[PDB]
Amino acid sequence: SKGEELFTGVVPILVELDGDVNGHKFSVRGEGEGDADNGKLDLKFICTTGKLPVPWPTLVTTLTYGVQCFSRYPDHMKEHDFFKSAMPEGYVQERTISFKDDGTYKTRAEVKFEGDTLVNRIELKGIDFKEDGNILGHKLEYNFNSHEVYITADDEKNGIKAEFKIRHNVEDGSVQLADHYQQNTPIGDGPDLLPDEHYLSTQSVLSKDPNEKRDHMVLLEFVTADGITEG
Amino acid sequence: SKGEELFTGVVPILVELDGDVNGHKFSVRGEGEGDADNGKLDLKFICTTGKLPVPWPTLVTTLTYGVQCFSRYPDHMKEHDFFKSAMPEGYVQERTISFKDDGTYKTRAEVKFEGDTLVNRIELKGIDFKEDGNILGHKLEYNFNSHEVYITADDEKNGIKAEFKIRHNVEDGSVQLADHYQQNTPIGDGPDLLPDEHYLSTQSVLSKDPNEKRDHMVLLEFVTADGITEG
Amino acid sequence: SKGEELFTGVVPILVELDGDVNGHKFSVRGEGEGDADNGKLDLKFICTTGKLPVPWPTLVTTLTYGVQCFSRYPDHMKEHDFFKSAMPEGYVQERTISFKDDGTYKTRAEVKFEGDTLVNRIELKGIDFKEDGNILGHKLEYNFNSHEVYITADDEKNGIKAEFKIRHNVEDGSVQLADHYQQNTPIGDGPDLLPDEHYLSTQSVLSKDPNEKRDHMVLLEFVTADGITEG
Amino acid sequence: SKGERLFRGKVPILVELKGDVNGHKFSVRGKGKGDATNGKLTLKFICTTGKLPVPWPTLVTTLTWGVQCFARYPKHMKRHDFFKSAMPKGYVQERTISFKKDGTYKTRAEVKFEGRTLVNRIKLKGRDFKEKGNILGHKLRYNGISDKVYITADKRKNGIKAKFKIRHNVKDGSVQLADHYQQNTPIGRGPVLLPRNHYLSTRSVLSKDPKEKRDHMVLLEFVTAAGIKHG
Amino acid sequence: SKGERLFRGKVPILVELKGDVNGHKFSVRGKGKGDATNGKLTLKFICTTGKLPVPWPTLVTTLTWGVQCFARYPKHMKRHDFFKSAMPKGYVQERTISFKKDGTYKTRAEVKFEGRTLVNRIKLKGRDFKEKGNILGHKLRYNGISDKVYITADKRKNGIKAKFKIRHNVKDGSVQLADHYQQNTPIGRGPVLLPRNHYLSTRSVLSKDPKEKRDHMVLLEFVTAAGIKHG
Amino acid sequence: SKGERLFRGKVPILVELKGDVNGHKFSVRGKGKGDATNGKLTLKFICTTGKLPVPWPTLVTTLTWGVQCFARYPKHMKRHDFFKSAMPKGYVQERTISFKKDGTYKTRAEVKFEGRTLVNRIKLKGRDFKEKGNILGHKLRYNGISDKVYITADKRKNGIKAKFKIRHNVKDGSVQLADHYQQNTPIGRGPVLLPRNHYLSTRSVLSKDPKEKRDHMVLLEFVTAAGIKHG
Amino acid sequence: SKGERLFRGKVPILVELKGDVNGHKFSVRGKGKGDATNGKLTLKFICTTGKLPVPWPTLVTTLTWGVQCFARYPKHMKRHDFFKSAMPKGYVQERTISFKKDGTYKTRAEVKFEGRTLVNRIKLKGRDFKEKGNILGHKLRYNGISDKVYITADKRKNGIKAKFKIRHNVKDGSVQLADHYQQNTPIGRGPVLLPRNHYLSTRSVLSKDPKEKRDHMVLLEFVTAAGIKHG
């Protein structure tokens, strides 16, 4: 009945997005594989409708960052895992990404299993952006920093939530701030009981593929968790 | 779903027997209470059909020794417990008690819950006894020693078994030997998986009641378990 | 006066058997050498009357397993040794090997010294076997497992006894069970006093000889003892 | 400490609850005594405002599972005791009882001495209960209640937090669940004992009084602890 | 040790089974390679005697869950490894696969090197299967398999023993269970590593080959360990 | 402890034996005092049923070698004392006195306080004595008795066990031996001292009273201990 | 050390004795080889001056029990070895063989290397032998010899001393004893190993050669050690 053993070894991943940013419509498709015993994660995105309106580091927290089930939890916290335990039924992840001095994103993803592969299906909507801003002007560097996500329980709706700040790098030297607010909720029967407060620690390495002519992105991300001492 | 928490504090006990020893028919009824957190056990028997053919220490291993669910297991072995985990459905306990140089017993008990009390229902049959023996001649002392029961798994029938030797004291100084061979089997769904080999260690204090005119027996028994080291 | 020093180094061994299994008469002769300082033992059997009715692993517990005087006792138990201390007078070893769902063996051996060599003389009788069984159908594999023998005192007849179960491997995957019950008794003056309860731990490697045309068996067995802690 | 000595001998118990479930208000007064040496409670409850909108088994964890200063801690811990150490000042207990596929209770309480009578004062407020459900439809059976209370320490608020779930029996043969998330915090300000990851083996038995007319409930609770291997 | 170095790089695998279920005999031959650095197996099985009386998912724990020397033990244990340390001599693995409300398998196996090809040789024998059941009626779905293998040490037989249960999916929506009790024992006689209470997170994925005609099965297994907090 | 203080000063001794040797019954009553500070006993025995079928030196180990709570333990041990620590509750002592080339005694006893008089109550039963032997033929000399009592601990039965042999002098110049195997077990249930492998240097001197007419014996025993090198 | 490496493989042995017993002079020359890995000696002795005044079993402790550098010390001591550590310089061995109710031998010897052949050079001188005794009357049987050699250390003379007794068999059925008191002292001056209270389990087997004419003796000796519980 436990979903913890479904993430042993290497799991196929499929990511799909439907975007709407000031009326600009696009779609991003990603495929790869994930290793939940080390937190090791590797996948590759393409933009199937030509060009991309928003920069690629703004979509890192939405594409391969809603699949948080590939987080390496240590052995003293394997029971405090909302994400692996809500499987193979899955969960729903809704955000509100608040850009500093600019507009916002509205995402809604439904991570679940479809057969053997782990399917992320995001529907993104973003309004109120500024022309010649840091986002629509493509003024962000092609890198993503190392961050921390404080996950806490949200008992009164049968789910969890998290609040954190994403610092994007700007071409001229300044820093673009993004404020995240996610709300998870399982599809049917979730875990046994909701976990204690603990923090995920992420690292990511953005790169490219020299043998591609489409607007693409190659990602390599390493997620572990801590925040609970020895008990 | 676990039956381990049903034995917290003090549980009412009811014991019933139907005997047949060389055609002599009798019945023993017992009531009391049990404390499964210390192994502490206390109950009182009466013989509702007048006199008793066999001695009272021969029926100690059959009356309050098939209710082994009141055994104090230590905290490092609470998952290796066949008896508390087969509750509240119960189990079936069948023996063949082989007396040295004499006949034998054939018991069959069905320990279970009936509401809130823990009901033992034994049906005993004993044949091939010897006249002027240690049993039918009432030549056994009114005491019971401290013994050990080696419980092992019996996978191929979904149950456990145990083999041990009971040393009865005789009036003149010799020792009467009894060889036990029990086979447990749960009623419906038993435990998760059958336990490892471990030994129960019993002590009992036989006594009387000065305010009784019926052929009776007062028992106080202390059962713990060991045999599995730190893991 | 002590017989412990008679087993230093390498001792010549001679084993002789006279069998009677459902009227089939045979004889097994064995020769080799034994090293009682390591438990190391090595000897070779031949069947001097042609073929053998029973399988060879059924006779391992009777041929080189009544000579238990080659057991490596550790230095903290050299005084708890019934077998080396009953030498050079010897002892008598009688068994009743109970096969599961089949008949039985009745052995009687007289292990002693004859000059310098250590002579085992077994007279075996076996009845009540089943045709097309695991024994007379030759359905047992040619291997012998690692077992334990619980030796205890038997004061009231000036000797010891042991009870253990031998698990034979069957050709199809099942397990044939043999129940042993031996009774030792010295010839004249035995040891000083009978030992405490301790267990022998055996290992054996069954093999063959490529340069033999007679129905034979080559055995290599390693016996140590434990069961008594530091005192 | 000086708080454990207050619990020797029988101590009277006063329990006062002021509830508000889905607009429907009620009040429950309880009285009785509590043994802390054995871990035994005997209370009798009455519904002062007539009928009751929720079933009696759902309020058991609010009334008498809040007086957890009457826990039988064994001889070998006596240091992992938050509940007795917060006395005679008291402590504040808040829960969040989240029913599966139904609404949620929100409780707060103050368990503290008033001279000698241990007085519990509960404010309860429930919401989001669907009509014609199990709880508002009185589809719950009138059975007892028993599980473990996994207690862990919380250094920040100078208190503890526990986390467990409860299986209620339904008249239709199904099981109604109840996730319990609680927090204890002392009233102040004397330093208390902070435990290390133990639990409370607890059972409560519900029955009625055949001499009453008002909507009532008679309760018998057994509390003990485990989970620490000091010995 | 000297046994771990034999598993670097891809090693071929030969698997030979000779089964006998309820009178119906069969044989299964398997071949392929196995990565021990990542804990990954790729085998292909064929039924040499035509049809198969038992479902393919029931034999997965016998064929490829017996080659457990291909386990990815992490960097921080490397000492709790019985499976690689018993090499190149090998080890003997025996199970008792007891189905709920149905009969039982009895297996023995020998996993050892033959030069370079790791050869597994299984003898299987099942009995007590009721006709028109889930297993003999082929009422099991063709899905994968995944659970944990709780491995504990056994000092007496110089080996280990593991104990786990398996949930098979049924076409009628129910779950067919399978209790596994196994024992490992080395062939001899070089001293090996005795672990301390770890487990094996394991998943196997079943699929078919669209180019075959015989009754076949393609298997992909992922093995890793956990349970020890060295770090 | 609280048991050692009961033995300061002279304590009276009552000894009652009810024997049955080879059909011939007898009874022996003894009385006197015992010094525990020096390890000295002075008793006088009388045969209440006239003559005696066994010699007086054979019953010395049953009567006064059973009151071993009067042992002079030195200043530097005072912790390896099972005999005084089982007081005032008492202990149960059972022996098996096996004569060479003759039968065996079977004794049980209860050494415990009755207010202030230390009362020993022996039941004895012997068998297998050949007629016209040393014992039944009264061929034993009337000499004293002295050897060591090698005491070792037994953790299982919460008692000790001792093991020694006794050399009786014969009128024909030969030596009649007597192997003694004893077991002590407390009546219960206060925890006692478990020793570590000491012994009792003991001598008893037999003499007669020239003022008596009945068959009698006057005894003078000296008990002390050694075997532990604390200093 | 550098002395143990000299004893790997078979080493030849030369033994030369010049005796003088009660005026009667003799000489014995011996030759052969000695295995130090197994603790095995094979020597052949001849009496160069014709007949021999003392029996051959009395001279066994002088000839071949003096070459004690060929002792099988086990793997777990290798530090309590005086005999191999005094090599290649050698050591001086002196005994005092005192017969019961008879005279005494006085021996000295030098066991040291001469290039590669280990040469033993014994001077012997006996006195006080009564005429027509066991030794001078040749009343000793021609049997072997075996006992333990209790070796203890001597710090003052930078050597060891051993002390043991030997039981020789007599033709009249009696036993002739032989008390052995020996002293070892190295020739000098390299510091050696001083042991701690071990002993030598030793057996020698005597036989004859059917191809000789002179008074001769063929010897086969087995030497091993024990007494230290390092493990």
Side-chain angles (χ1 to χ4, degrees), chain D residues 171-184:
Chain D
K171 294 179 182 178
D172 291 328
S174 65
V175 171
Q176 179 63 254
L177 279 75
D179 298 335
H180 286 82
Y181 301 101
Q182 79 179 1
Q183 296 176 359
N184 294 112

PDB file of all heavy atoms in Angstrom, chain D residues 171-184:
ATOM      1  N   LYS D 171     -22.008   1.892  11.852  1.00  0.00           N
ATOM      2  CA  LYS D 171     -23.115   0.939  11.826  1.00  0.00           C
ATOM      3  C   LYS D 171     -23.214   0.169  10.514  1.00  0.00           C
ATOM      4  O   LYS D 171     -23.761  -0.938  10.503  1.00  0.00           O
ATOM      5  CB  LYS D 171     -24.430   1.670  12.078  1.00  0.00           C
ATOM      6  CG  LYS D 171     -24.549   2.266  13.461  1.00  0.00           C
ATOM      7  CD  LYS D 171     -25.864   2.998  13.611  1.00  0.00           C
ATOM      8  CE  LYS D 171     -25.990   3.636  14.974  1.00  0.00           C
ATOM      9  NZ  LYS D 171     -27.266   4.385  15.094  1.00  0.00           N
ATOM     10  N   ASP D 172     -22.707   0.719   9.415  1.00  0.00           N
ATOM     11  CA  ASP D 172     -22.754   0.066   8.116  1.00  0.00           C
ATOM     12  C   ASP D 172     -21.587  -0.883   7.884  1.00  0.00           C
ATOM     13  O   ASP D 172     -21.442  -1.404   6.774  1.00  0.00           O
ATOM     14  CB  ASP D 172     -22.792   1.114   7.005  1.00  0.00           C
ATOM     15  CG  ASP D 172     -24.100   1.869   6.967  1.00  0.00           C
ATOM     16  OD1 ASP D 172     -25.140   1.268   7.306  1.00  0.00           O
ATOM     17  OD2 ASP D 172     -24.089   3.066   6.614  1.00  0.00           O
ATOM     18  N   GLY D 173     -20.754  -1.119   8.894  1.00  0.00           N
ATOM     19  CA  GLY D 173     -19.614  -1.997   8.761  1.00  0.00           C
ATOM     20  C   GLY D 173     -18.335  -1.331   8.300  1.00  0.00           C
ATOM     21  O   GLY D 173     -17.297  -2.002   8.242  1.00  0.00           O
ATOM     22  N   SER D 174     -18.368  -0.044   7.972  1.00  0.00           N
ATOM     23  CA  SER D 174     -17.177   0.662   7.521  1.00  0.00           C
ATOM     24  C   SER D 174     -16.427   1.223   8.727  1.00  0.00           C
ATOM     25  O   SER D 174     -16.768   0.952   9.881  1.00  0.00           O
ATOM     26  CB  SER D 174     -17.559   1.750   6.523  1.00  0.00           C
ATOM     27  OG  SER D 174     -18.354   2.746   7.138  1.00  0.00           O
ATOM     28  N   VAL D 175     -15.382   2.008   8.471  1.00  0.00           N
ATOM     29  CA  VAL D 175     -14.556   2.605   9.515  1.00  0.00           C
ATOM     30  C   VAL D 175     -14.431   4.097   9.244  1.00  0.00           C
ATOM     31  O   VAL D 175     -14.006   4.501   8.157  1.00  0.00           O
ATOM     32  CB  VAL D 175     -13.162   1.950   9.590  1.00  0.00           C
ATOM     33  CG1 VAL D 175     -12.258   2.717  10.522  1.00  0.00           C
ATOM     34  CG2 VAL D 175     -13.271   0.520  10.073  1.00  0.00           C
ATOM     35  N   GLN D 176     -14.805   4.911  10.226  1.00  0.00           N
ATOM     36  CA  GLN D 176     -14.650   6.359  10.168  1.00  0.00           C
ATOM     37  C   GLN D 176     -13.354   6.733  10.870  1.00  0.00           C
ATOM     38  O   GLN D 176     -13.156   6.385  12.037  1.00  0.00           O
ATOM     39  CB  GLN D 176     -15.840   7.055  10.826  1.00  0.00           C
ATOM     40  CG  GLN D 176     -15.766   8.564  10.841  1.00  0.00           C
ATOM     41  CD  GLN D 176     -15.767   9.153   9.459  1.00  0.00           C
ATOM     42  OE1 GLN D 176     -14.742   9.613   8.974  1.00  0.00           O
ATOM     43  NE2 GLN D 176     -16.919   9.134   8.810  1.00  0.00           N
ATOM     44  N   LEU D 177     -12.475   7.434  10.168  1.00  0.00           N
ATOM     45  CA  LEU D 177     -11.165   7.743  10.719  1.00  0.00           C
ATOM     46  C   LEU D 177     -11.162   9.135  11.339  1.00  0.00           C
ATOM     47  O   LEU D 177     -12.077   9.933  11.143  1.00  0.00           O
ATOM     48  CB  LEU D 177     -10.085   7.630   9.647  1.00  0.00           C
ATOM     49  CG  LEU D 177      -9.527   6.251   9.279  1.00  0.00           C
ATOM     50  CD1 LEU D 177     -10.477   5.436   8.427  1.00  0.00           C
ATOM     51  CD2 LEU D 177      -8.240   6.423   8.544  1.00  0.00           C
ATOM     52  N   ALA D 178     -10.108   9.425  12.103  1.00  0.00           N
ATOM     53  CA  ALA D 178     -10.008  10.697  12.814  1.00  0.00           C
ATOM     54  C   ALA D 178      -8.530  10.980  13.067  1.00  0.00           C
ATOM     55  O   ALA D 178      -7.937  10.368  13.956  1.00  0.00           O
ATOM     56  CB  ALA D 178     -10.782  10.650  14.115  1.00  0.00           C
ATOM     57  N   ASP D 179      -7.955  11.907  12.309  1.00  0.00           N
ATOM     58  CA  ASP D 179      -6.553  12.258  12.494  1.00  0.00           C
ATOM     59  C   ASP D 179      -6.421  13.300  13.593  1.00  0.00           C
ATOM     60  O   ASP D 179      -7.068  14.348  13.542  1.00  0.00           O
ATOM     61  CB  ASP D 179      -5.958  12.804  11.201  1.00  0.00           C
ATOM     62  CG  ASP D 179      -5.968  11.799  10.084  1.00  0.00           C
ATOM     63  OD1 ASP D 179      -5.972  10.587  10.365  1.00  0.00           O
ATOM     64  OD2 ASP D 179      -5.954  12.226   8.914  1.00  0.00           O
ATOM     65  N   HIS D 180      -5.568  13.029  14.571  1.00  0.00           N
ATOM     66  CA  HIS D 180      -5.381  13.908  15.715  1.00  0.00           C
ATOM     67  C   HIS D 180      -3.987  14.511  15.691  1.00  0.00           C
ATOM     68  O   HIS D 180      -2.992  13.782  15.643  1.00  0.00           O
ATOM     69  CB  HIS D 180      -5.600  13.149  17.019  1.00  0.00           C
ATOM     70  CG  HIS D 180      -7.036  12.854  17.305  1.00  0.00           C
ATOM     71  ND1 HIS D 180      -7.703  11.785  16.756  1.00  0.00           N
ATOM     72  CD2 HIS D 180      -7.925  13.481  18.106  1.00  0.00           C
ATOM     73  CE1 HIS D 180      -8.951  11.780  17.184  1.00  0.00           C
ATOM     74  NE2 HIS D 180      -9.110  12.797  18.008  1.00  0.00           N
ATOM     75  N   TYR D 181      -3.920  15.838  15.735  1.00  0.00           N
ATOM     76  CA  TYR D 181      -2.665  16.575  15.796  1.00  0.00           C
ATOM     77  C   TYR D 181      -2.751  17.484  17.010  1.00  0.00           C
ATOM     78  O   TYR D 181      -3.552  18.421  17.012  1.00  0.00           O
ATOM     79  CB  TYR D 181      -2.452  17.411  14.537  1.00  0.00           C
ATOM     80  CG  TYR D 181      -2.421  16.646  13.241  1.00  0.00           C
ATOM     81  CD1 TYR D 181      -3.527  16.621  12.408  1.00  0.00           C
ATOM     82  CD2 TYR D 181      -1.282  15.978  12.835  1.00  0.00           C
ATOM     83  CE1 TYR D 181      -3.506  15.941  11.221  1.00  0.00           C
ATOM     84  CE2 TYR D 181      -1.254  15.291  11.650  1.00  0.00           C
ATOM     85  CZ  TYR D 181      -2.370  15.277  10.849  1.00  0.00           C
ATOM     86  OH  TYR D 181      -2.350  14.595   9.662  1.00  0.00           O
ATOM     87  N   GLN D 182      -1.948  17.235  18.040  1.00  0.00           N
ATOM     88  CA  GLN D 182      -2.090  18.041  19.239  1.00  0.00           C
ATOM     89  C   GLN D 182      -0.793  18.736  19.612  1.00  0.00           C
ATOM     90  O   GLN D 182       0.297  18.360  19.176  1.00  0.00           O
ATOM     91  CB  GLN D 182      -2.563  17.232  20.441  1.00  0.00           C
ATOM     92  CG  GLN D 182      -1.540  16.424  21.145  1.00  0.00           C
ATOM     93  CD  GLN D 182      -2.136  15.702  22.324  1.00  0.00           C
ATOM     94  OE1 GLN D 182      -3.333  15.804  22.578  1.00  0.00           O
ATOM     95  NE2 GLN D 182      -1.306  14.995  23.069  1.00  0.00           N
ATOM     96  N   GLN D 183      -0.944  19.773  20.437  1.00  0.00           N
ATOM     97  CA  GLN D 183       0.150  20.589  20.937  1.00  0.00           C
ATOM     98  C   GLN D 183      -0.096  20.860  22.409  1.00  0.00           C
ATOM     99  O   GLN D 183      -1.196  21.272  22.784  1.00  0.00           O
ATOM    100  CB  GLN D 183       0.240  21.923  20.195  1.00  0.00           C
ATOM    101  CG  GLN D 183       0.551  21.828  18.725  1.00  0.00           C
ATOM    102  CD  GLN D 183       0.529  23.179  18.058  1.00  0.00           C
ATOM    103  OE1 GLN D 183       0.254  24.190  18.699  1.00  0.00           O
ATOM    104  NE2 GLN D 183       0.805  23.205  16.762  1.00  0.00           N
ATOM    105  N   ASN D 184       0.914  20.640  23.237  1.00  0.00           N
ATOM    106  CA  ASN D 184       0.859  21.005  24.642  1.00  0.00           C
ATOM    107  C   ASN D 184       1.849  22.127  24.912  1.00  0.00           C
ATOM    108  O   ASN D 184       2.940  22.157  24.337  1.00  0.00           O
ATOM    109  CB  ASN D 184       1.178  19.819  25.543  1.00  0.00           C
ATOM    110  CG  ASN D 184       0.140  18.738  25.467  1.00  0.00           C
ATOM    111  OD1 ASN D 184       0.397  17.649  24.961  1.00  0.00           O
ATOM    112  ND2 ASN D 184      -1.035  19.015  25.999  1.00  0.00           N
TER     113      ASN D 184
END
